[PDB]
Amino acid sequence: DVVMTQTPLSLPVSLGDQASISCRSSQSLVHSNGNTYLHWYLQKSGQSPKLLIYKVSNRFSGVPDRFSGSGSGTDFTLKISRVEAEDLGVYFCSQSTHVPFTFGAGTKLELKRADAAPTVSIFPPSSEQLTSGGASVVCFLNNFYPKDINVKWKIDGSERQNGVLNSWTDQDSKDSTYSMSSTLTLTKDEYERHNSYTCEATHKTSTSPIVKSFNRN
Amino acid sequence: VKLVESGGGLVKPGGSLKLSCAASGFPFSDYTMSWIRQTPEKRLEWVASISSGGTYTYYPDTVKGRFTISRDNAKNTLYLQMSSLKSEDTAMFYCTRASPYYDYDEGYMDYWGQGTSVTVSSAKTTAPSVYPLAPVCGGTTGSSVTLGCLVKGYFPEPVTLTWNSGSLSSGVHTFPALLQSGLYTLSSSVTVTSNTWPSQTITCNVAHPASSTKVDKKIVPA
Amino acid sequence: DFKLLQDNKSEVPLDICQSICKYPDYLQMSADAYGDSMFFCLRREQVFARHFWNRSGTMGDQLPESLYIKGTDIRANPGSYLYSPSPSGSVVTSDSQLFNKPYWLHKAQGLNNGICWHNQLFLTVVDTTRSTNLSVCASTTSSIPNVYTPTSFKEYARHVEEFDLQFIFQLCKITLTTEVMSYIHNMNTTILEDWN
Amino acid sequence: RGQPLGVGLSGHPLYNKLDDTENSHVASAVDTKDTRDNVSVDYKQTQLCIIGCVPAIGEHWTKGTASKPTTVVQGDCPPLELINTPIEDGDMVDTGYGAMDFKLLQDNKSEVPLDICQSICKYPDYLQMSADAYGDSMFFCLRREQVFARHFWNRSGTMGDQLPESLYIKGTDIRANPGSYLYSPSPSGSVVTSDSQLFNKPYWLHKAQGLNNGICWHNQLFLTVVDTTRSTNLSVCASTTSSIPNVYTPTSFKEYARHVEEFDLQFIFQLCKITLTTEVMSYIHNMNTTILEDWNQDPYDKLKFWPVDLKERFSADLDQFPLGRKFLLQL
């Protein structure tokens, strides 16, 4: 029913700065009753969500003074005075004024750091996998910043999208760098039908695509 | 205060499953309880809510016929009776506490449980195939060398992510599994000094309890 | 004990909101062995509920959901269900009057038949049929300007109690035999102690 | 009886009160929404006392079984059946709304206060116990009840009985829905005075109402008693903060309602002989075989009573007790 829109979904900030997350609803959110029932939750990495603010502007027990909720009607905001280390996580914005209780969609409070070029490594299919009839080539793009990055597999030659499986990690607890893995799985026959395999990484860091490639030896 | 979810597993589609939640540290029979699930895409959704006494329950229309929340105030326990589940109901289910009886159900959940993940898919339990990832040739072979281990074709989650029997652990990136054709695929990379390997053995240990298998694979230069 | 059982300081009028209301334990005094506590007793009380009210404050006892149906708003807090009436003593009439009358004690309720041990006598009496209160007010100006404003008059409430106790006593002998006197000793050693 | 005389209220937050039908010039309520008000009431005043050797028999109305093997529509009025049951400790008395099974005959859960809305109100069947052959159920009975109608009300809900059109004229709007014509008054027990008091007095049984003249067969005695003249309720409240900040807010106090009952039973028993002749004993056998059997298991433990053991409290020194002295004024 009611939809919750957070702005933005990813808010990179440095420690000591101010943070502001916006939340808008499609309906008035003011109950046929005294108060407005909008809440803010905080979820940290691999930890259940935890209540941060209830009823637009009431801090939960044990919530520091830095967090401050505000807003009314359909427009709400959350302000953090001084972003600290243990404030990094997904911030959810919930509404329970109207049934069903609805909340979305997650706001990642990430750390702001200096740019870093990715470290790319290719690995051909192992000897054990080639005995099973398949061939998987893996490309690791480790320790880069910012989060935005693009990968392109090319055989030989021509780009192939019909076999790529991608996975990303979140901000590492050490130095706040991102990483990515891309595994392209093809049949053994198609693997033996080509010689050169190239993994290409286009990243926001200077300059132009960073390339890694290999041949059959 | 403790909210502990439990029960029961990862089960076939179109079948039933019962979820339990043990409460401690507060008058359980005085609060209205609720179930909140988190999708694999990491979005939180409201599943159910039951009154302080098990007489009043309410759900969203997306679960109106399948789920049935209940509670035992004598046992201080909360239950979610799911039946004829579809694959879209795959989630980490959380047991949450709302407002007490003497308040309007204000709908904020202050205390959350640890969570119990249930997934529903037609795929059967299959042991993973582990493959080592070593560099064939070497240009700028030094500073540093990066090995890898691949966990292909297992179901269901989870698996153990350890390198060298819990040693090392530094410079390790274990990537979240991605699913295709009802099967999981996971990858992990490790970075060590170039003059350290292959002088000393580096092996990835992967355990899959769902299939009751445990395999440790050593990476060989090949 | 309204002072100890009501931290609100707001459930009962100022008369008792920080005091203790005691009721005579006729059951205990009548079952007494010797009957010294009470050998003459006259009670006459009346009350009815004049107005019905509700008490604000969170209900400590959860209303069992087996006893009602919540209605369409299935998340509705049930209203306050702690009801306290305003008492009232109805009509005060001289037909129901209990004092200004002679009362002759022949047979007591207990074994002590009106004997005033240690030459003392305790008289407990409650009479709420004369509860009228005088309202005395004095002007704040030395002489009142012939215009009324509440700020130029101080209001005071005073109450008055008036009694006149009358008694007819009978002189008695106690032959200090054996069996007796030892019985008096087991009753109260201080009785023999005050005599000889 | 111990506690002081008082009047106490019983109520319901969602009482089915539609309109004031007495002399209301305020307004009229709309039937659409939940027209249930928070209503309290002081019940009918009742004092009763029954002495026997068998638990007293009470009557109440219940949802009678289906008249015939007939399928009746849901929502129809069920048949009413009068039922006699032994009166156990804790049963509810008639309070001014009648003696019936409110749990079975009122699915509303909103017609009577919380005291009785899910309970059974029983009234002693004086007619049946007095017509008893042996008179074991009741050989001493004192009743004293009073009640009046304080407020007149209307009940919301669709009228199951169609108002016959012979009894009214609809007016110009020949579409007019007839207003609710199910009227239920609020009972009230009026003044409680010690002049009307029925306990704290000695009562001497000489001639019983039945043939059993106060003989306690099987060495037991059942005493049923109702006293609503001490219905005052203690209101205890405790602060939610460890110590109250000298500022009052309704959220900082928990409110509890507690009630208290105090009794002190006293009895004077007389020892009797029974010469076990023929004709006798055979008459006793036809009366209760278990009387001879216990001389030379229990069906009443299925019921809930307040046990009072006086085997260790019998005394022949009557002048040592108040009732004993009052009985000494009987020679």
Side-chain angles (χ1 to χ4, degrees), chain C residues 73-116:
Chain C
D73 199 356
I74 201 174
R75 30 198 287 252
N77 188 357
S80 181
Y81 48 75
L82 202 152
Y83 314 96
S84 168
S86 63
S88 180
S90 180
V91 183
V92 167
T93 172
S94 48
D95 296 335
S96 299
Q97 201 63 211
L98 197 128
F99 302 112
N100 285 3
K101 304 169 51 186
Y103 294 102
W104 315 114
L105 183 143
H106 292 102
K107 325 175 194 70
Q109 69 85 21
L111 265 58
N112 191 329
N113 194 53
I115 294 186
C116 310

Side-chain angles (χ1 to χ4, degrees), chain A residues 25 42 48 55 94 113 123 129 150 166 168 189 211-212:
Chain A
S25 66
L42 167 138
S48 59
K55 297 198 286 174
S94 81
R113 64 160 298 158
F123 301 95
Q129 186 181 16
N150 300 270
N166 303 272
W168 301 262
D189 298 42
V211 85
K212 284 295 177 283

